[PDB]
């Protein structure tokens, strides 16, 4: 089974935090 769907929908927002916080820094 393979909920591309979901997977799309989902997997929508996430490489930004990592970029966020990597641009963001601290």
């Not at 769907?5 to 601290?26: D, I, P, S, W």
């Amino acid at each position: 089974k393979k909920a591309l769907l979901a997977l799309a929908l989902h997997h929508l927002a996430h490489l930004a935090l990592h970029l966020a916080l990597a641009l963001k820094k601290a």
